[PDB]
Design a protein around this ligand. Sequence first.
Ligand SMILES: CC(=O)C1=C(O)N2[C@H](C1=O)[C@H]1c3c[nH]c4cccc(c34)C[C@H]1C2(C)C
Ligand SMILES: [K+]
Ligand SMILES: [Mg+2]
Length: 994
Amino acid sequence: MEAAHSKSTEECLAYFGVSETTGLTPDQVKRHLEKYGHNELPAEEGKSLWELVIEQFEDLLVRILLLAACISFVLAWFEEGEETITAFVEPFVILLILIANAIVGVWQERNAENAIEALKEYEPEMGKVYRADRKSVQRIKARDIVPGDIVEVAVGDKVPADIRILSIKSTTLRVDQSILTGESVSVIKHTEPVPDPRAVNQDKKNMLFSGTNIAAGKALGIVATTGVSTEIGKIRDQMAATEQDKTPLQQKLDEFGEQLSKVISLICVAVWLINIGHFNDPVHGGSWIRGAIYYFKIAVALAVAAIPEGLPAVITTCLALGTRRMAKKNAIVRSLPSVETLGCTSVICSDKTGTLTTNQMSVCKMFIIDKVDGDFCSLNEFSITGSTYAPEGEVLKNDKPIRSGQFDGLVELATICALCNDSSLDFNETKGVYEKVGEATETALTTLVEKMNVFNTEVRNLSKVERANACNSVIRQLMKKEFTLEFSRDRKSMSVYCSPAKSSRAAVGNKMFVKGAPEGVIDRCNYVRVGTTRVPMTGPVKEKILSVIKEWGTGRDTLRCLALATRDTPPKREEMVLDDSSRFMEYETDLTFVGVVGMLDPPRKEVMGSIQLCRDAGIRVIMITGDNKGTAIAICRRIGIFGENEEVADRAYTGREFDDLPLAEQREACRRACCFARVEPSHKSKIVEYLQSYDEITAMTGDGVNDAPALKKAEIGIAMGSGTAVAKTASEMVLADDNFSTIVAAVEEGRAIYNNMKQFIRYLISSNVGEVVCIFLTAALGLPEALIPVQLLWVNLVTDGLPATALGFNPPDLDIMDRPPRSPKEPLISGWLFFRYMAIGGYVGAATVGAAAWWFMYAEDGPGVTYHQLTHFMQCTEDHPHFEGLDCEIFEAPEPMTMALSVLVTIEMCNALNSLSENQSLMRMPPWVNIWLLGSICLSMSLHFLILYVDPLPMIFKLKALDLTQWLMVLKISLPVIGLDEILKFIARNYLEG
Ligand SMILES: CC(=O)C1=C(O)N2[C@H](C1=O)[C@H]1c3c[nH]c4cccc(c34)C[C@H]1C2(C)C
Ligand SMILES: [K+]
Ligand SMILES: [Mg+2]
């Protein structure tokens, strides 16, 4: 039964064929359980199983190093060196780092919770059912419950399934639908049917929802739906049938991984083709096994060269250092990649109450009737001071303080505000200020009564606690509050039956004090109270009322107006059916209009600037409020979403309005919409869908299970610090202070992070491109090896890793919030950016080879050799006369490899200084600004010397320390990389920018 609310209690029993007294026979239970299934949610299958790390080794860019480790393992054994511990190092360190980054990569255990698993906390353990096989109440497993079961609920019980209420045993039934609404006020239930077949859950007053808990009372009902067919269950499937795409940056890294793998395979073929000259060599002039070693070692050389082994470790550290900054600005970020895509936020859909507004309801203005004479109709408007729940304020007419008690209309005005009120005030001594008890709207009314004091009660002689509900209680002394007709959206009003206390206070029998929305209440007023007398509600009178109400709501005041009326001659106590929530509007007819109060929902202090900030940032802000379209628009103008005098007749839609538009016009509306009022529960996810259809990264906000699918669907789901648990588990970010400013503040941080992130990524790539050119030149030409793969590991992981991490602390480029959002499918490196790091990579490939070539030819300690014979070092043992000077071991000396290594490091330190900005020169951007960079550079050279002095290190790295004679040449070939890159920067700012 999906429409149990629309059916009567008799029809719902007849449907399942079950007696309300007996219940379901065990024969029916077997049939229903086999048909509808168990009352439970499906389990999740993908926990911390051995599958964990394995999937890291599925993409091509990591299986190459796993393959290169196999090749390295072959070459680590096949050697004529009696060396011991330094044998298995090249395949060991590769494998160790391979596992290390895999463990870092498989970090979804601590930095990624579950939202659907959290939704299994609502489904209770056991529930009370009345089966036919037993007389007494028997509690069974909640999952054993089937549709049609005659279940029982009491105070404290957690509702097991969606249940159509049959009979209420207690006086009144209240349930805590906090998870399915976000609110807190326990709603009242009834048994009479909700005629509307497509009514929302808030209107289903005869239904208990699975996951809800009864706040007060005890009732009996029949199960409508179980499992996934419940309201919670249906929301689960919406989140279950929603795939979450990985952030665009990660796709670029995966795309870069595929392209890089093509380059690596290309060179290995290229090297194979350069070595085609060995096809014309005598078989009796060597061994093919000596060639295979060369082919295999160059293969693993290119692998460790082209690939940034440190990058996954650096970004994971960088993002973690971002989250701590997000938390300092009241922005708890759940997942790590979220801090990157957060900068690419283009649209922020925020709720009004709580985020955009401080939620400080305070009655500012109120009016009553002064004089009615046919066409003439004057009002008595009053203003109230004090935007707080504290009774520290005063009422003034025409900017002059007046006694509210001297006006008869104001007395009945304060009377209704006091009696027709379920909220109150309570003074807090720990904090030192007053606090609200119940709803914020009604508490503001309680505060108003205290400020007015229509009976002039002593206040200065009272304490701070007695001050809270002082005047309000005095009103409760006059009238005895019989019963309260609960609020409902069908009539948008609330009344309360009051009987006069035994003291003969001149009361015409009983009275009904009505409080509700102006539209409905005013139309149900046949009479108008003018002080004490009563006049019939005429046309001209209603014109004045609605006009002022319109002025207070549409005006710059942006007030929430509440019409207050009273029923002078109410129906008898016996004639009223209290269980009928549909006859409540009928009982609230023939009313007499008293007055209208106008309270304020004040904007945050910082949202004014934050809104303006998003204007310059190119971030579209969309407000979602519960106000009427008119006031919704006015608040938009007030906070800066709209101009004070600009046209927005198409940029704001009500829920009703947006629903009457066809699917095409709905999508067309979501690109220009900035204000949504009276939004239906499903519209928030619809808006996200439409926004994502324009490739627009959306930051939707919410704080309930209703908002859970929307938060799951949006790129940046935003929950509140006070929001429900499930909303937080479905969000990517949780605002600690529930502010809209901390959304904007987080986005600015995320944009600065992404800029510094892209900078060191290109920095590491620049080194890797160079190690390709270096190995390619030293292999194609036939030169002796310049760089060992065991060295390249410690170069990219440490020597380049530390300054790259320090590039994350690069100062945020000012005027960054004056640029549009970073495009999703924006290439990391393309065009000039490719050629820029192509030239740097090419130069350092020649600088390293040239360094080793310098020591081999034009050197001090190096032998006097020429280039044409250096390329033929593999013939030192064969061609003896052409190669003569010393041992053949001098071609495999540690000095020239130390040259290429020291030069590569020295350049990368200069390249890190070049990565202080993308285009700003080193003359414009001082190389001493980023202190963390200089501190990292000094640590790099300190470790570079540590592996050349402490004997257990240079033997493993196959290096030999240089003196001042050799270090001079290192700087002469390294430092010119600064000038070359400086030229490129100047070209980019002169013949490219425009
Ligand atoms: C074994 C494993 O967990 C991993 C790592 O060990 N790595 C990275 C990585 O994810 C590899 C990777 C995939 N996509 C890219 C883009 C840019 C750089 C890298 C990667 C580094 C790759 C490797 C093998 C170092
Ligand atoms: K999401
Ligand atoms: Mg990985």
